[PDB]
Design a protein around this ligand. Structure first.
Ligand SMILES: NC(=[NH2+])NCCC[C@H](N)C(=O)O
Length: 590
């Protein structure tokens, strides 16, 4: 059995009530939200304010308070509602039954923290990371990677069948000069696998040629046509160059703990020929300067689906890719995690796909989840002085360094070398790199700051991961092992008489409702906001309620309130999932 979405349950209850009080009213508002101040209950329903605002006319405006009255008068018998009260104009304040909350806290402790599955399976495709081969993967790709991983995890946790696609840029004209140069530098590449060093030095080598030698440029353009032509030798060089890129990428994905099925633009090369003919045959194609282009009614720009030279484009592959995901993959949802600079691009592509009838946005969710740019502390584009793209591995390396530094006051002397000399160091470094991104609205520009993100106090992974170790330490330092806790879970009636154990209990039980909202807006920062809220709710609890009494001298225990122990476990279980959804790896000791 799994956690219950209280907002959905409450919406279902007031739903039946409103239908009973006002049977002829259609699509009444059902805004149910958690109360911030315990004064006014645990949840609030505003539907009576919204209902009067529906029936509002020129001459007559019904009092919300009377509506509230009819609504509450028709509340069905339910398991979660203690009592309700009508407040102010017509706010409906909701108090949860103590039994319900207590029992649900127990339920997550015994069956673990988990979501109710989809009634029917659903396939979600998440298109993220997607660096360009031969060019340096940059912080834009980092964001996509971090955000996409966490989205994927969220839908997995929610029971969706998730396909993680790395839509890599491996079909550009970027390859012409690279291949030509490979051929010149390693004339035996066809047999002797060439020792390409850093792909970027090699790119820079061939780009100087590309920019200075007119005749070389021509070869490069031909290599691109031969590559599209599936020429064996040219294709072999393309594989060898991609191989080299792949091993570098795998370093980053392993570090970041990310799993991705590679499926670059090159994957769709056959399907692109069809895509072009299908737009031609349906009459959507216009010839312009030798280019085959497509105007989508409503859009600011046309799609270029074939260049003058017969070469396919980024528009061509996105069109091939969205089509195969709709028909072959039979996706119920496709999520594109790409920088906001490409909004216009994806808006036109989706428009193009609807125009030719590949999907109905009411039946299939197709969603561009964009994100703002990465800035330094100067509010200009995050670069390396000067003024070039920063190696992600360097970025990560600098994280691991600063994390260890933090730890050496003075924790190199408490923890195992494993506990520290990796577990805490890597956990904090990567956690802070992820948390600093995801904890802010993805849409906004993001100031990448090692100092802000590694800070021990406030909304950081450093605070939260530490708060997590403390919460675990309580049962640890009272010798209540995992078998005792599991046992206690099955037997102890969790008690919620204190103000702070009630605040904390009802906060814990909000986890499912938080996640479900994120499935709709794909705003992961509210999950962060909730982890932080949860930590704060815990600290307030702990500072008002003893989990163990040690009785002064000589401070050696002699009392364990097993229900406040369990509360601690429920907090950490929920925090642990949350971290997991964000791709954050909590440690035990730190
Ligand atoms: N379906 C997609 N277009 N996914 C994103 C591709 C991102 C592209 N490789 C870039 O560097 O900008």
């Amino acid at each position: 059995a799994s956690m219950i979405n209280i907002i959905s349950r409450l919406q279902e209850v007031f739903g039946h009530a409103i239908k009973a009080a006002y049977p002829d009213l259609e699509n009444p508002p059902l805004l149910v939200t958690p109360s911030q101040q315990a004064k006014f209950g645990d949840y609030q329903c505003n539907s009576a304010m919204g209902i009067s605002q529906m029936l509002k006319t020129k001459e007559q405006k019904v009092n919300p308070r009377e509506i509230a009255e009819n609504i509450t008068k028709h509340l069905p018998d339910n398991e979660c509602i203690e009592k309700v009260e009508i407040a102010g104009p017509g706010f409906i304040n909701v108090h949860l039954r103590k039994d319900f909350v207590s029992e649900q806290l127990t339920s997550l402790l015994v069956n673990g923290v988990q979501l109710p599955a989809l009634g029917e399976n659903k396939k979600v495709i998440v298109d993220f990371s997607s660096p360009n081969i031969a060019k340096e993967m940059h912080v834009g790709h980092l964001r996509s990677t971090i955000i996409g991983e966490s989205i994927s995890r969220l839908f997995e946790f929610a029971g969706y069948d998730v396909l993680r696609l790395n839509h890599v840029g491996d079909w550009g004209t970027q390859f012409g000069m690279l291949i030509a140069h490979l051929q010149d530098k390693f004339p035996d590449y066809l047999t002797v696998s060439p020792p390409i060093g850093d792909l970027q030095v090699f790119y820079k080598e061939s780009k100087k040629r590309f920019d200075t030698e007119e005749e070389f440029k021509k070869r490069a353009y031909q290599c691109v046509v031969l590559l599209q032509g599936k020429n064996p030798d040219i294709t072999k060089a393309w594989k060898l160059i991609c191989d080299v890129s792949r091993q570098e990428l795998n370093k980053i994905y392993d570090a970041l703990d990310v799993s991705l099925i590679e499926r670059g633009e090159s994957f769709y090369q056959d399907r692109m020929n069809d895509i072009v003919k299908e737009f031609e045959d349906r009459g959507f194609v216009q010839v312009d300067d030798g280019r085959k282009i497509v105007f989508v009614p409503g859009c600011s720009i046309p799609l270029t689906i074939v260049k003058s030279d017969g070469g396919y484009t980024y528009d061509t592959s996105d069109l091939a890719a969205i089509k195969q995901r709709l028909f072959e993959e039979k996706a119920d949802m496709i999520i594109y995690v790409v920088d906001n600079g490409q909004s216009v691009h994806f808006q036109t592509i989706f428009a193009a796909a609807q125009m030719i009838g590949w999907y109905d946005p009411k039946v299939t969710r197709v969603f561009h989840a964009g994100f703002g740019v990465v800035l330094g502390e100067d509010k200009k584009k995050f670069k390396t002085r000067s003024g070039e793209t920063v190696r992600l591995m360097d970025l990560l390396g600098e994280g691991l360094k600063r994390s260890m530094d933090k730890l050496k006051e003075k924790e190199r002397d408490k923890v195992l070398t494993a506990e520290e000399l990796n577990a805490a160091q890597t956990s904090v470094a990567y956690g802070c790199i992820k948390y600093a991104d995801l904890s802010r609205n993805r849409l906004n520009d993001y100031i990448f700051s090692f100092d802000k993100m590694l800070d021990d106090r406030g909304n950081t992974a450093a605070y939260l991961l530490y708060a997590f170790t403390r919460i675990r330490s309580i049962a640890r330092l009272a010798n209540i092992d995992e078998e005792m806790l599991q046992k206690a879970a099955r037997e102890t009636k969790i008690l919620l008489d204190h103000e702070k154990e009630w605040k904390l209990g009802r906060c814990i039980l909000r986890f499912p409702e938080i996640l479900q909202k994120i499935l709709d807006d794909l705003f992961l920062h509210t999950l962060c906001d909730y982890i932080y809220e949860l930590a704060t709710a815990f600290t307030e609890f702990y500072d008002s309620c003893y989990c163990v009494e040690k009785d002064r001298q000589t401070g050696k225990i002699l009392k364990v309130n097993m229900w406040r122990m369990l509360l601690c476990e429920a907090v950490a279980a929920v925090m642990a999932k949350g971290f997991d959804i964000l791709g954050i790896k909590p440690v035990q000791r730190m």
